[PDB]
RNA sequence: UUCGCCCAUUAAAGCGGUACGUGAGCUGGGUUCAGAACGUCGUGAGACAGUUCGGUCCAUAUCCGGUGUGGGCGUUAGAG
RNA sequence: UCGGAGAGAGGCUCGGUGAAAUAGACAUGUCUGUGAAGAUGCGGACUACCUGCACCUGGACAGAAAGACCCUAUGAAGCU
RNA sequence: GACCAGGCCCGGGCGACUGUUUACCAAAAACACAGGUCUCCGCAAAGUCGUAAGACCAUGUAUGGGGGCUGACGCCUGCC
RNA sequence: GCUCGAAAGACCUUCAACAAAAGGGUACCUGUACCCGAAACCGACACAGGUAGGUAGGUAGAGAAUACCUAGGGGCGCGA
RNA sequence: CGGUAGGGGAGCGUUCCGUGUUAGGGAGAAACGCGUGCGUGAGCCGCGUUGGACGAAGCGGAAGCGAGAAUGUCGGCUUGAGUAACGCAAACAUUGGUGAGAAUCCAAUGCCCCGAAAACCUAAGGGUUCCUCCGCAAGGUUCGUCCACGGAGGGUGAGUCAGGGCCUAAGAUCAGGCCGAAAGGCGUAGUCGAUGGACAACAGGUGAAUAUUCCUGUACUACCCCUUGUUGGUCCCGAGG
RNA sequence: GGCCAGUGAGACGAUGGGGGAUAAGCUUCAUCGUCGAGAGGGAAACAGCCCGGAUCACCAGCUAAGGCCCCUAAAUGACC
RNA sequence: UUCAAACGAGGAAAGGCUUACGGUGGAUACCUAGGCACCCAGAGACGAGGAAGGGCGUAUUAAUCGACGAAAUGCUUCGGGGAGUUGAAAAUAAGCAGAGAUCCGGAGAUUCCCGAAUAGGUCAACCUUUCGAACUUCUGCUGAAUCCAUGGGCAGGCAAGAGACAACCUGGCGAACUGAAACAUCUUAGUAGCCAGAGGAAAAGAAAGCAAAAGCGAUUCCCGUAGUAGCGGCGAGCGAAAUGGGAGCAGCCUAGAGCAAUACAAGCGUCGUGCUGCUAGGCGAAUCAGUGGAGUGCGGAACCCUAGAUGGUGAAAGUCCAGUAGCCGAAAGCAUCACUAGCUUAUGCUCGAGUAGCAUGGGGCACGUGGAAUCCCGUGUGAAUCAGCAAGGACCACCUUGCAAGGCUAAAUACUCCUGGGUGACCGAUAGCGAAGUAGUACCGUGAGGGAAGGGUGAAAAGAACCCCCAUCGGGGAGUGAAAUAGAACAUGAAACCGUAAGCUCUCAAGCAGUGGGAGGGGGACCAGACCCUGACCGCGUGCCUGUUGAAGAAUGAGCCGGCGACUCAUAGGCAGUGGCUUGGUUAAGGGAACCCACCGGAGCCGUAGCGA
């Protein structure tokens, strides 16, 4: 969104040169130069949209790894479905007291353990994503070494990055 | 196109230029284009002095035994004197081994000797 | 107009270079600035190394180089 | 033609206020020769204490002007 | 007798003259001027302004007016 | 504006007109300071440039010429 | 293994963002020096001082990615400079007053210039620059207790002057209407617009600044109403003027 | 064969020939080399002539061209 | 101690270099209730019951602005809500207030003069009569030229004529530069620009279409089909359609009587009700003690949390404050959807009716007439008319389809002055809109029109009493503050430029003057060990860049410094590197309970068999 002067010296003025012949002064006018202060501008961001078409079968393969890499190490395990009834976090932090990890030793906490809905309680929490058990991006998966699943996204993401 | 701010970029661009301009007479340390005009010749005749040092030297050798030929008695050249090591078998005494002349002008004498007999 | 011719002298009354010396000095009279007119050329606009009338060309200059005159210092003990 | 003198407004000195064209950088002498061939800065050589003021004013193809001359670019603007 | 206060004459080119004009370099034998002649219109004119209406030209009217060249006067203005 | 006449239509013992006290009342709204061929105007400035009209004395003289004097206004704003 | 234009092969740094409210910082960024160690290089790292806030290691990603010249652009600052100039040649000085200081302010004695003028009055324009009490850095190409400089107050009081107000020329606009692609043009009744025309007083005095307006003495014109006398009056007019 | 270029007014010396007087670093072709996109050493100073054609350091030697009285290193060395 | 000769430091008017300390000036680093873009959701209108835009005034002195308007920075009424109120740049003076003194929002009153303005006129904000523009539609009253009839005129009730309208949209008229490496065809633009009207959507729209003998079947918009075919000094250049996949997606009126305007529906209103939004608003959690000028910092510990978005408070908290999630509220005034109502039009069934071409000369369809139609026209004419006619890119026959000559019609589709929230690897006051501090002002020109400079001391200013010098300008101290080597030129404050002090060099020496060798001197060394800073003298030695076969110059550009300033972006195609898959690979629009641009969508494009007109 970087908008800049298109068109240069078509700014709230024009171009209204001098007589430009036996002066001295640079041959030019005044004014939307733009080199001179109150003009347009020559070069400039656009309205830009930089966004790469990926295709499918692509993004499937380069998705599994996220988890595979993840289950290899030692990091935070599945839970179960009971975990979307609690309404309150309260109720998490005493949990997340379990698994180990309370300070929060960084940002390595992708939580993923919801499925038809989002977590607003798991959201609150500084640091912590609440991913949907779908598009499960390279990105937010490697953000965040630590990952907290359950019984049921487990099964959603057979379905896509499976069969 | 509002660029990325030179600001503290090209101030050192030419400041550089400058702490290397801190022995110079003229005011060819006060500006980058008085300055621009002598780094290039610190630029080239550094490469050159650095090949001149050598030859600089090459014509002094020379110079001080020349000083040192026209007292002894070899009034003909230092030339022949090579030569006498040459065709006798001494690798040492070199151009700048002759500063032998100068100092301890004792040793010096006896080559003046043995270069006779060789030749 | 340089030159040249003519009248009158001088001992003789020179040539040439110096961007045909010299306009960051004058003159700028002639001549490629705009006007106008005659002859000639083109149908014409105009044109012509043909002619004619009139027709604003600045500047307190640092340095180099000069005409002159001083301020200091060095010639060593300091001066006349 | 040989001009001179004198009276005023500047110029010169001091006090107060207080510009500019221009300029890559300077410890920017002459001369011969040389050099894309009439440069102080190349080479040789000669000459020459350092630094101002006033004045005369040739050099730095000085300054102002990407010349109105010619040509080039199947440019432009009027006219016949 | 201070201030104030035409220089005159002779010959010759051209334009009759006064006047006007390239406002900021040319004001001149340039231009303009009256005089003469050719040509168009009896007209709501020709013609000019305007796509139009309208209107100027004349609420005059061919000793009118409009356009072109010439262009005081004097002697004249040929052939094709 | 003023004066006079108006098929004396409308008015028609009326309303009005002229004059007399050249009574009484009223005459609302604005500008009108200063300068104004002047440095407060127009030109970038306190640039001797340019700019309409009116009043305008004594003496010499034809003269709002000219020179010297009135009233009056200044010495022009860097000096020695 | 010299190298231009060019082609090809490798990297640094700057702003921002993802990985970062992890970590470094008030026991402290930024601006300057130094260690002149380090890399092929542009630079990097550490640190002193000053200084005041955040900035940011590594890889990658996205860049408006670092110029001493395009008679560049903006701003500031040198040089010729402290040379010229200080702006018609109608010279100036002195005795005093006030002030820190004044040749140029004020006051007094004169010189000198102009004298149909560098007098006054008035229109246009300007427009408060007029007057008084103070102050002065800036504006006055000298200073200034001076000024048409700045900062506060005060001051333009006419029915007869002038402009509105009646009328009107060039000309503009202009109902209905005539015309024109739209717009609009032209044009009449009518209606505007002047340097045009139409009723009416001045001479003195007074105030620091205004005055034919304040004051004094003496007058004038028009309209409405009222009183008296006489008489017939009367439109956007005809006619005379 | 494929991707991205750049450059089409080059100059000079030797040699072999047209143009000019076999006059020009002049002009127009062919060939080689250099400059032009490589310094340096030497011709005093002259890019294009000659030698040699520069990754770098080094108070390291030997040579090419050109020289060896001094000025800037090097034979007023020997014989005719 | 005397005379000569050979040498000789020491001396500077001034200057150069290094270093230290300042000034001028101003950049950078850092931070900004503001711009630059965009998304979602609304609003798309005001107005003679008089507006936009301004002048003149108004508060307690009170010039300038923000409002309002001589009931003049305020009044009346209802409500929310909660205390302070007299707007701001400057206090003060004088007060109103603790259940309507202010403020915030809605509904009204008031609202001079000037500007459509509509009284005439007018150098607008002025003048003079006066309650009156001029038109369109309707009614009544009068009424010419000739008996009527009109024309014309008068009066009254509405509307229309104004915003000198930001973009989008329809319509009328209508270029050039430039491209065609020349240029009159053509293209470039039927854009820009001028003008008229309306809506907030317009326009268009249910089809004498297309295709075809299979069938689809309103218009518009998006992605493809081809940027092929076709058109063209077939040169430049422009550029179809059929068909397919999607968004969206409803079809109805007008064109002789009898009984007779009862039923069923569509389009609205004087007003009102309900749902859902807009214009005020309320409820809304959580810890201390220690270092430092201060901490929201660090270390220990505890708590809230569907609210750790964000900002502020003398430096980084979620737990201080305002908010934030969520949960509620609006006497009323309104938009968009529904449900009911005055009046006019509109309405069912049955049985009918059903609105006329071309030649020539033009424009528009991709199509500049070419074989190339068709559609809309200026002009002259002008048939048939549903056992009839048109279209199928010449014409003709057959077949098929469709039947316009009058009109209306939601949504998908476009854009934006302006409103509320939010987002942005956008910038940050020589940036960005010219305007983030009372600039499109001050200034320039007659005018149209053109068009700046200038940012922040600190947390709060306690922004400096008094004392000393001076003309009671200015400074230095005394104090305040963690800082004024922060104080109104003020933050961090470099460079160009301008000086002082200190060491060295510097009058018999010259040429873009540095470099290599290199003595001496002023300092710093190590309990020699010969080094770190200045530099006499000496060998060489004619800036850079651009343009050129070739220059150092008399080849040209440049005064210096800071900042600023030139191959980026969109689409498509052809290659190289690399990655997934593989003779297969891959989507575009769109849909999407989407922490998310996945999934679906493969309509479509490319390739493995080619070649030939």
């Given at each position: ?163 | ?57 090459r014509?002094l050798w020379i110079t001080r035994i020349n000083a040192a030929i026209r007292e002894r008695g070899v009034y003909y050249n230092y030339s022949k004197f090579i030569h006498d090591l040459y065709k006798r078998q001494l690798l040492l005494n070199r151009k700048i081994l002759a500063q032998i002349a100068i100092?301890?002008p004792?040793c010096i004498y006896m080559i003046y000797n043995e270069i006779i007999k060789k030749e």
């Amino acid at each position: 969104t970087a908008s800049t002067l298109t068109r240069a010296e078509v700014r709230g003025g024009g171009r209204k040169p001098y007589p430009q012949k036996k002066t001295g002064r640079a041959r030019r006018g005044s004014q939307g130069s733009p080199l001179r202060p109150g003009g347009g501008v020559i070069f400039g961001p656009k309205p830009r949209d930089w966004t790469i078409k990926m295709n499918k079968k692509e993004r499937r393969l380069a998705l599994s790894t996220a988890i595979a890499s993840a289950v290899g190490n030692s990091f935070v395990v599945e839970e179960f479905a009971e975990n979307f009834e609690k309404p309150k976090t309260k109720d998490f932090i005493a949990a997340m007291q379990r698994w180990g990890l309370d300070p929060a030793e960084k940002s390595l906490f992708f939580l993923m353990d919801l499925v038809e809905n989002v977590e607003k309680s798991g959201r609150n929490i500084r640091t912590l994503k609440l991913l949907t058990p779908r598009s499960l991006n390279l990105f937010d998966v490697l953000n965040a070494e630590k990952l907290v699943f359950t019984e049921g996204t487990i099964q959603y993401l057979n379905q896509r990055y499976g069969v | 196109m509002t660029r990325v701010k030179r600001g503290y970029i090209a101030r050192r661009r030419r400041k550089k230029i400058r702490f290397f301009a801190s022995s110079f007479r003229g005011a060819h340390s006060r500006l980058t284009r008085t300055i621009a005009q002598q780094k290039i010749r610190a630029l080239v005749s550094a490469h050159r002095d650095r090949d001149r040092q050598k030859r600089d030297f090459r014509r002094l050798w020379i110079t001080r035994i020349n000083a040192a030929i026209r007292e002894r008695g070899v009034y003909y050249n230092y030339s022949k004197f090579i030569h006498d090591l040459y065709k006798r078998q001494l690798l040492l005494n070199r151009k700048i081994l002759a500063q032998i002349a100068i100092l301890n002008p004792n040793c010096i004498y006896m080559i003046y000797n043995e270069i006779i007999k060789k030749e």
